[PDB]
């Protein structure tokens, strides 16, 4: 009965092979974070990295023994906090969902120290974790050895796993609020302020929108320079007039050079944004894809907040 177990052998794999240097807490949204990083509370960071704190304190000589370092860290003086920032700066940490269904259930992130008590998770990554912020708890693991740190940065990293292992289409796809913001920004009306204007660059579009001299969506001719990957992999700058909307030009500002403008000159649903990310990854590469995904997240959140999209009793 001690050998036979479910599921699998108990002590070896499950249940459950407990591990040290780990923490657990409730997760919240991280809408300011970059994709390759996640918010980690100061207290969990201190408790997780106590050996690292001791090592660095004895390295710079602020403590003459491990016991003195322990007293310093339990007093939580401001001195140990700079050491903590130093050890966190490069160290990646693994974030894990309570159930793990596929390999995306564990992903590395660069921890960012935050006052508070909950792990801030990148909004794009919650889709992979199948984690909704309704009290879900995630665990954090610390890859100790240098080989493990490197191994996490190379493989465990979120930016290295932008595509699902079951299908080539990206798994970090804008999901709900950012999609709504993008849709409101790109969806066109039939009449609004500043229709029929002629603009050069999307910068004038953003200026007109932020100044309130035009509406977020209105049919406008804008002169824009689209770049096309052609010949042997060289950018082809073509500058001409497109009939589009102000919100679409504002979005095109975000879009990295190398994509056709036709991808954004349309109403953007979930499918449209997913296809656009897939095209961006296939045409440009990894780094432009990650940067563009982060930028589109920020833009979608901002313009969703500016949208004021609300569900009443009359809608």
């Amino acid at each position: 009965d001690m050998i036979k177990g479910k599921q699998g052998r108990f002590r070896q794999n499950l249940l459950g092979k407990r591990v040290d240097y780990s923490g657990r807490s409730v997760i919240t949204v991280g809408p300011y974070l970059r994709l390759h990083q996640c918010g980690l509370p100061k207290k969990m960071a201190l408790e997780l990295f106590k050996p690292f704190i001791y090592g660095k304190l004895e390295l710079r000589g602020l403590a003459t023994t491990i016991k003195a370092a322990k007293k310093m860290v339990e007093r939580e003086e401001a001195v140990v906090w700079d050491i903590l920032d130093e050890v966190i700066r490069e160290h990646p940490v693994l974030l894990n969902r309570a159930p793990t269904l596929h390999r995306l259930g564990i992903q590395a992130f660069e921890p960012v120290l935050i006052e508070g008590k909950a792990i801030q998770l990148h909004p794009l990554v919650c889709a992979a974790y199948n984690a909704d912020f309704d009290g879900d708890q995630m665990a954090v693991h610390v890859p100790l050895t240098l080989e493990a740190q490197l191994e996490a940065r190379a493989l465990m990293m979120s930016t290295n796993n932008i595509l699902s292992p079951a299908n080539g289409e990206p798994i970090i796809v804008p999901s709900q609020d950012v999609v709504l913001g993008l849709y409101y920004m790109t969806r066109d009306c039939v009449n609004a302020k500043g229709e029929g204007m002629v603009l050069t660059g999307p910068k004038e579009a953003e200026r007109l929108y932020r100044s309130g001299l035009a509406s977020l969506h209105a049919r406008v001719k804008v002169r824009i320079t689209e770049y096309e990957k052609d010949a042997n992999g060289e950018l082809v700058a073509k500058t001409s007039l497109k009939d589009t909307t102000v919100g679409r030009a504002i979005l095109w500002m975000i879009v990295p050079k190398g994509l056709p403008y036709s991808i954004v000159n349309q109403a953007l649903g979930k499918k449209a944004i997913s296809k656009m990310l897939n095209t961006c990854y296939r045409i440009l590469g990894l780094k432009p894809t990650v940067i563009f995904a982060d930028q589109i997240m920020y833009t979608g959140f901002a313009y969703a907040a500016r949208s004021g999209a609300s569900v009443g009793i009359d809608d």
Binding site: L146, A154, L155, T159
Partner: protein, 76 residues
């Protein structure tokens, strides 16, 4: 901070022995004996190894040849 390792994967196409070679480089970096070849921003050995491999200073071959030459001056 090194957001992406794709550039490193470009130099070392296996993406697994890349971890081994960069781990060896970073361990020689942390354990005393070797001095850096790329400027740092108060960073640990990992992103140093990533940057060194990314600019092509370090791969499997350079690390191996260097451990030879150092073996020859220490034996003298």
């Amino acid at each position: 901070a090194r957001v992406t390792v794709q550039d490193a994967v470009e130099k070392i196409g296996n993406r697994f022995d890349l971890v081994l070679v960069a781990a060896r480089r970073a361990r020689q970096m942390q354990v005393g004996g070797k001095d850096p070849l790329v400027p740092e921003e108060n960073d640990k050995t990992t992103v140093i190894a990533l940057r060194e491999i990314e600019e092509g200073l370090i791969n499997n071959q350079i690390l191996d040849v260097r451990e030879r030459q150092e073996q020859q001056e220490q034996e003298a």
